[PDB]
């Protein structure tokens, strides 16, 4: 099973079918893309952070719209769509900063706020998964592990890939993000079909 095939499968459903904006999830080599922004970077393709931040912003807007369409209010966090500087807020810790954007440079010179934000977002994606799967044999294709901040290539390599940048490689981080976008694409197909 290839992630590209999983995306095609979802695109087949989507083509046979309404939202305020359009959210087109696809692939470009090793990258997952959303509305043409690459969500990742590679040693050989140093995607600018403005583009990564924009991809995050569209991803947040998508999950926000999916949750609003379903009547789902997330636990633990709320999404704050804010263009290319989108973020979450913790519902229990008003202090906590959870930016889904970063500026350039080296992981070394950063705190963990962006990484915490991405794990909080994966928590929300997993909550969405539980709602679409409730009751149907339907399942989003890639298992998510919120405790560890990882996504599994279920039925592919079987490996688990971190959504955090710290202690990770750019190629594995990009893979995790691409599996996450595939899950959201499947979610959009299911939501567009069942609502």
> Following CA atoms 177, 178, 182, 187 in sequence, which dihedral angle do they give, to the nearest 10 degrees?
20
CB of 54 closer than 8 Å to CB of 39: no
d(CA 189, CA 176): 20
Domain locations along the chain: 1-195
Resolution (A): 1.5
CB of 19 closer than 8 Å to CB of 65: yes
Bridge partners (DSSP) of residue 42 are 45
Count of beta carbons in the 10 Å neighbourhood of residue 91: 13
Give, as one character, the DSSP assignment of residue 148: T
Instruction: Return the exposure string of 69-87: e unless at least 16 CB atoms fall within 10 Å of the residue's CB, then b.
Output: bbebebeebebeeeebebb
d(CA 33, CA 123): 21
d(CA 101, CA 86): 7
CB of 143 closer than 8 Å to CB of 155: no
Q: Which two tokens stand for residue 26?
A: 């696809």
Q: Which of 41, 13, 38 is nearest to 26 (CA)?
A: 38
Between vectors from CA 14 to CA 11 and to CA 20, what angle results, nearest 5°?
Answer: 125
| Domain 1-195 classification at class level | mainly alpha
Interhelix angle for 170-194 vs 49-70, to 10°?
30
Interhelix angle for 113-133 vs 170-194, to 10°?
30
State CA 158 to chain mean position distance: 19
Q: Which of 164, 181, 180 is nearest to 34 (CA)?
A: 181
CB of 93 closer than 8 Å to CB of 120: no
Residue 122 CA neighbour count, 13 Å, CB half? 26
Count of beta carbons in the 10 Å neighbourhood of residue 11: 15
């Amino acid at each position: 099973k290839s992630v590209e095939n999983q995306m095609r499968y979802a695109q087949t459903q989507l083509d046979k079918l309404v939202f305020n904006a359009t959210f087109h999830i696809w692939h470009s080599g090793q990258f997952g893309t959303i509305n043409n922004f690459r969500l990742g970077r590679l040693p050989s393709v140093p995607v600018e952070w403005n583009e990564i931040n924009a991809a995050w912003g569209q991803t947040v807007l998508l999950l926000h719209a999916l949750a609003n369409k379903m009547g789902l209010k997330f636990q633990r966090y709320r999404l704050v769509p804010y263009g290319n500087h989108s973020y979450l807020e913790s519902l229990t810790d008003k202090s906590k900063e959870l930016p889904l954007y970063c500026s350039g440079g080296l992981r070394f010179f950063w705190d963990n706020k962006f990484d915490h934000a991405m794990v909080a977002f994966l928590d929300c994606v997993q909550q969405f998964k539980e709602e679409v799967e409730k009751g149907t044999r339907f399942c989003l294709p890639y298992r998510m592990d919120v405790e560890k901040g990882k996504i599994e290539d279920t039925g592919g390599s079987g490996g688990s890939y971190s959504i955090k940048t710290q202690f990770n490689s750019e190629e594995q981080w990009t893979k995790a993000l691409k599996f996450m976008l595939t899950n959201l694409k499947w979610g959009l197909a299911w939501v567009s079909s069942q609502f």
